[PDB]
Structures are given as structure tokens and as C-alpha cells.
Write a protein that binds this DNA or RNA. Structure first.
Lengths: 62, 62, 62, 62
DNA sequence: TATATATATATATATAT
DNA sequence: TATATATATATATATA
């Protein structure tokens, strides 16, 4: 994923990377709430459009 | 280069515009304006500014 | 170096420009003002600053 | 002396090495005044702890 | 892409008119 | 009341 979605300054994106990871991790628990101790690398459903709109919201926060 | 309205061209030390590069840059050395962000005298540096520093000296020497 | 108007040349500690390097640089070491970005005091760094640090000590040794 | 203390890493050492030498020279001049024309490599005493104190005072210079 | 040093409107406050 | 004077934040260039 870090290769396919994030493309910048091969390793110079420490902010965006982390926030992306947080978004995915906290979104996975919404759509599969029964499972426990879910991590990034874990293979379960996760929608990308939701994550895009999530960051697009964080952008204009006040 | 200045960014004011209707001055998207280079500015001379006498506040005069440079329409075509090929006709002036060849004659002799020129003098330009100071770079500043004041709205009355706004001007931003150019594309290749500062890059061609060592080459000039090397060539003059050779 | 100083980038103010009609000051496309170096600047020393006592606000005095220079025309021909060969006339003063040899006599004795000199100190210059600090790099700054003020619109009034616009001073940038030189082309060859920093690079030549080691060979100086090597030569002082030999 | 540049191998025992300062490892080869962190090539961004222009400032570090210069100020290090400039500190050792003065620390040497202080504790052995009778002599003259001292240098970096000249074998006279110096307090490495004082070198540390100086470098720190610089690290927090305001 | 990042940090950082510059910058500039926009309060609120002080004082004198 | 009016006038002037001082901190906060927010957007833009420049360097690496």
C-alpha cells in the first residue's frame, strides 16, 4: 500500500503516512466491529473513498 | 520578475518591462529591481535564479 | 554577498562594497556581516562558502 | 582526534568540525600561556569537559 | 514535500482630544 | 470619543 497509494520523496512523508495509517486503522473497526485487536497490516475490508473524504474533511477543520 | 497586475514580465532597474528576451539579454549586462513581498513593489525570483553561479566563473576563467 | 539595489557585489562588516577581489583579499583576513533576508538588509550566502574547510588545515600542517 | 570522538557519520559537519577546532585551540592557549604559536595538533593539555561545556553553551545560544 | 523565517490584517488596550 | 499603538495567527517564498 505504501508503494501504491503514497508516492512522494520516497521516505520524506512522515506526517501523511502516519495519518493515512490512522485513518485506515480506525476505519477498519467500523465495518467489521466483531473482531478484536485489529492492526494496519490485517486483511479485512476497508473503504478508500471514506478515507479520502475523511482527509478532505480534516483539511478544512476550524 | 514582478507579479503586479499586467506586469507578468521582467522588470528593469528603471521600472521598464522586458517584452522579448532575445533582443536585450545579448547587448550588455542589465540591472533589475529588488525582490520584495510588499504589495506595491512585489517581485519574485525567477526559474533559474541562483543556479548558474559557478559556471559563469569557470567559463570566464577558461 | 549583498543583493540590494546597485549592490550586486560583496559587503564587509563596515558597509563597504568591493569591485576587484584581487586588491584586498590577499592582505589580511576580513569579516563580513551575517546572512539576512530583511528587505532593508538583504544579504545572501556566497557561492563557495563552506566547501573549503579541510585543505586549509592540511596546508597549515604541512 | 577526529576519529576517536566524532564518528564519520552525519556528513553535515561543516559547522561541527570548524567550531570544535576553534574551541580546542583556545582551551589550549588558556592552560599553557608561556608558549606561543599554538595549533590544533600541538601537544599541550586541554580539558575535554570544558570543550563539552562550551559546545553546549553554543547549542543553547540566544 | 517539509521547516523555518519573513509578513500582514485584525483585535483589544491606552491615552489623549 | 477618536486616535494611535501593540500582540496574535495565517498565507507565501526560499532552501535543502
Amino acid at each position: 500500500l505504501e508503494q501504491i497509494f503514497i508516492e512522494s520523496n520516497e521516505h520524506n512523508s512522515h506526517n501523511q503516512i502516519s495519518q493515512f495509517r490512522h485513518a485506515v486503522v480506525r476505519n477498519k473497526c467500523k465495518h467489521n466491529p466483531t473482531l478484536t485487536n485489529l492492526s494496519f497490516d490485517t486483511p479485512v475490508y476497508f473503504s478508500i473513498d471514506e478515507v479520502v473524504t475523511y482527509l478532505e474533511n480534516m483539511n478544512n477543520e476550524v | 520578475i514582478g507579479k503586479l497586475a499586467g506586469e507578468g514580465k521582467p522588470k528593469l532597474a528603471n521600472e521598464t518591462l522586458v517584452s522579448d528576451r532575445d533582443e536585450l539579454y545579448f547587448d550588455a549586462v542589465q540591472s533589475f529591481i529588488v525582490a520584495s513581498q510588499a504589495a506595491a513593489t512585489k517581485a519574485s525570483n525567477g526559474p533559474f535564479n541562483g543556479e548558474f553561479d559557478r559556471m559563469i566563473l569557470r567559463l570566464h576563467t577558461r
